[PDB]
Amino acid sequence: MPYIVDVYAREVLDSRGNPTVEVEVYTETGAFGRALVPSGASTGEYEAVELRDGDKDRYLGKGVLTAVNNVNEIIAPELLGFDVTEQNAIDQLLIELDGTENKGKLGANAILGVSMACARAAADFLQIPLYQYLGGFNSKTLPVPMMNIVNGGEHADNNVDIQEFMIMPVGAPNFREALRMGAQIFHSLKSVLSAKGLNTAVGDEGGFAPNLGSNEEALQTIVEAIEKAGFKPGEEVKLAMDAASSEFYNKEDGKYHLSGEGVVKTSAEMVDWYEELVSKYPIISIEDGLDENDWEGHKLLTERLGKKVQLVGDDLFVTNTKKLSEGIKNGVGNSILIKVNQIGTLTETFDAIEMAKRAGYTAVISHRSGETEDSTIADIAVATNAGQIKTGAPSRTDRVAKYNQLLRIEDQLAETAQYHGINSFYNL
Amino acid sequence: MPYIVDVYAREVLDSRGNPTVEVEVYTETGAFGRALVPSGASTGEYEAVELRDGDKDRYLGKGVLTAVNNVNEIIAPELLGFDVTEQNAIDQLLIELDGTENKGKLGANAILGVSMACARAAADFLQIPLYQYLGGFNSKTLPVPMMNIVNGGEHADNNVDIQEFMIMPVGAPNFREALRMGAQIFHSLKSVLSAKGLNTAVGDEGGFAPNLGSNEEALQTIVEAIEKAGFKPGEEVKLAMDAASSEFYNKEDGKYHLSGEGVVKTSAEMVDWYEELVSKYPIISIEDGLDENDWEGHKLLTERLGKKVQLVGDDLFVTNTKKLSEGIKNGVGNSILIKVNQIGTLTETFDAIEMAKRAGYTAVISHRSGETEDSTIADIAVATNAGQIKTGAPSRTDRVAKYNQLLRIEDQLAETAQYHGINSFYNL
Amino acid sequence: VLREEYVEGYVVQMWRRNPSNAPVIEVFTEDNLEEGIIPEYVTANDDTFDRIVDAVEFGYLEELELV
Amino acid sequence: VLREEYVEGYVVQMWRRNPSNAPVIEVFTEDNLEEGIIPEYVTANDDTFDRIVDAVEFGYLEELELV
Ligand SMILES: [Mg+2]
Ligand SMILES: [Mg+2]
């Protein structure tokens, strides 16, 4: 009965004025879906690459014609008269139309837009909410927001070598208090940085970017702001890092060049530095602590700390049906990094989360550092019981669209909505 | 819109002539649910006990009046005008009506009947299949049947000390071939046992019960039947055991009395015996290998074999919100045993499977050795991706109702239905 | 007829030979003793007949629902 | 009036004192400069005003949706 009659993509402008692609799916009965095609970055080679025009004269390589023609003239004639409540058949049909492994024929963005519009239309046809269409009836556990607070490294001009510092409010009863706590910690940190006499302007992903001297100064300032906000660190507010150690790894000699501290550390001294930082400050998660071509040091790191600090890895578990299952076998790291708009459909996302739940890992919903978003990721973070979402975005009107979409789920689950808190750290 | 107007339980007779209790739930729009109240055993003390009349003059303690009055006069006046597509609110309301921990006020069977009738009515109202109401859209992976083949110990009069031997066809492409393989292995074993000149009558849970001499003779005969059926053991057809070591454990001295072999083994010799049986025969699962009061030997067993043989444990992880989380912390065994009609509602089942998926364990859907069934367990085994179901039943007309209910799911998932096979042994 | 062989809810009645003709095996239920289902044998020997008997027990043929 | 303090999509306008009266803080959007939302302060100092300003940035008040 709910057969698809029209799949149609168009070009609209965002708040930034950049052109975005918008996929719509009509039915016979009048159900309606709508999803945004991402326009992000195409880093990596062993995963699904995103396809733009690449025209630097047209928005620095974010062209839309080759992304909208592939939807209107190839994908659309193969989806007439097809039933819309059959998500797995559509996700197999789109991959068979693509043909290659890295989705390089249609782009990994044009497939994801259709495969979420055809899942927002089926939730409109059945008159159930989208987090119950994707996840059953017992999908009621909102994730823990990872909220970028201080930038450094490539994103700023300062002597901070770690790229991103994050806070993770785990001592809150429900999601709304977990968001209010972060809203107060940002004000306390702006007060502290204005007391020191620094720049308090909002940087890239929402965090600040002051002129600091070392990593230890930043970890002093953030913990001092958490204490002045009124909360106890290590019990209610944890921290996290995104080290981005590939940026200061010199390949020719295999030594890490910490430009902030001016000290060249070898691959056995970085783990000794991370042990000191975990022993002094309440870090609970480290992202890309060592380069992915440093197996002799990475196997050391995953057992010196891997029982009390979460260690995620993106290119170590790069999103493919063969390469993500490679680092599972030798057992390095204890958490993987689900990136939805680099992974393809909605079937491969829920298989890649399940294969990480089996092998004892922990999924962290994330995104590449320049993509836009959409608002369906807040339903995938509830329906899969992922546990941690990374609420960063390149602009404020996408960040607030993450926040409101996760707050309009708790208001439907009124007497029922759980929250992880510290129970997401089961393997620590 | 779909408000409940009538909850009503009655008494009907099965194929055995025993009285069974049948719960029905009506709606306003005309949706309809129907579930069977179990009438099993109440073993254990730290879990939810089932409540009958206990009258030995009325079907040896399977009375129905105290199970149908609790539904018709207590549970039913609290569920008028309530919305039927809200499963979590109903499962919290029933526990608040119960009050105690072991469900001993209403019985753990009268709550489960209502909490599955109110989930088969909601799947009828939304016009979706029941394995997608409970599990999302990506619930497509049928479990591996564990099929009881040779009984021993308490269930028969022979010198076999292990209670139940099982076969697990893991080399099949889909579920229908996995059932056909077992259908041929039973014929080959009946041929072998008739060649030896033994009794080939069907025993308790569906398996045979011949007059054998030792455990090694049974493990020779089953492997010889697998080879004569045409299949390769260890690659396509595994085995399993249910040791039931509590039956021959003498408590006063702490020594195991193997009455079959006539040898009294201590707690360090049983693990040496299990290593020999795993090294000679393709056992992949051992159930209750040591008694639950033998921690000094059980901690030995869970590391001598726990990386290549699944070790389930029922009373070690007895179904409660506190006691099932006790054996997780010290880390004994690597699989738990979900028993649905001893655990209560449908919310606590899907939480107890999720807490086992987090801590690296493996769920095995099972049942107490004397309960009847219902046919909704075949939808819980698909919707949770449990992986192993135990298709035994006290009578044939319940066993075939398990088989047909798992075969009418593969015929709806026609081009989509997965199968575990050997991929369910991820922690080995 | 040949080897009626009453089983639980069914009968597996190999026919009469209908002279100079190969016999066939059919599975009937308790009523309706004239419909017949062919269980896709290859030879209809005694061993094939025993295979069909032990397949009606345990409750799986590929040809009938077997309630 | 006192400290208009233009922010991105809103204005946080503490009123005039309306002499011998405690001032109040209200959050208006760009249009509709006469409706006003009370953000549930306790004192309406300068520090409370800066708290409301830094709460309109980062996009969470408990009183308004903040599109
Ligand atoms: Mg991180
Ligand atoms: Mg990132």
Which value, in Å, is the CA radius of gyration of chain A? 22 Å
Terminal CA distance of chain A reads: 49 Å
Q: What structural category characterises the helix and strand content of chain C?
A: alpha+beta
- The strands making up the biggest β-sheet of chain C line up spatially as 1-2
- Percent helix of chain A, as a range, is 25-40%
Q: Any idea how many domains of chain A?
A: 2
Query: Got a strand count of chain A?
Result: 16
Q: Describe the largest sheet of chain A.
A: 8 strands, mixed
Oligomer status: heterotetramer
Number of helices of chain C: 1
The small-molecule ligands in this entry are:
magnesium ion
Largest interface: A-B, 30 and 30 residues
**How do the SSEs of chain C run, as a string of H and E?**
EEH
User: End-to-end distance of chain C, in Å?
Assistant: 26 Å
Task: Count every helix of chain A, treating DSSP H or I runs of 4 or more residues as helices.
Answer: 12
What is the molecular shape of chain A?
A: globular
Organism (chains C, D): Bacillus phage SP01
Protein name (chains C, D): Putative gene 60 protein
InterPro entries (chains A, B): Enolase, Enolase-like_C_sf, Enolase-like_N, Enolase_C, Enolase_CS, Enolase_N
Cofactor (chains A, B): Mg(2+)
How do the strands and helices of this protein lay out in sequence?
The complex is a heterotetramer, with 2 copies of chain A (428 residues) and 2 copies of chain C (67 residues).
Chain A: E1 4-13, E2 19-27, E3 32-37, H1 65-75, H2 87-98, H3 108-125, H4 130-133, E4 141-142, E5 144-151, E6 164-169, H5 175-196, H6 215-229, E7 237-242, E8 249-250, E9 255-258, E10 263-265, H7 269-280, E11 283-287, H8 295-304, E12 310-313, H9 327-330, E13 335-339, H10 347-358, E14 363-366, H11 377-383, E15 388-390, H12 396-410, E16 418-419
Parallel strand pairs in A: 4-16, 5-15, 7-11, 11-12, 12-13, 13-14
Antiparallel strand pairs in A: 1-2, 2-3, 5-6, 6-7, 8-9, 9-10
Helix pairs in contact in A: 1-3, 2-3, 5-6
Chain C: E1 10-14, E2 25-29, H1 46-56
Antiparallel strand pairs in C: 1-2
The complex binds magnesium ion (2 copies).
Residues 242, 366, 369 of chain A line the site of one magnesium ion.
Protein name (chains C, D): Putative gene 60 protein
Organism (chains C, D): Bacillus phage SP01 (Bacteriophage SP01)
Binding site for Mg(2+) (chains A, B): 242, 287, 314
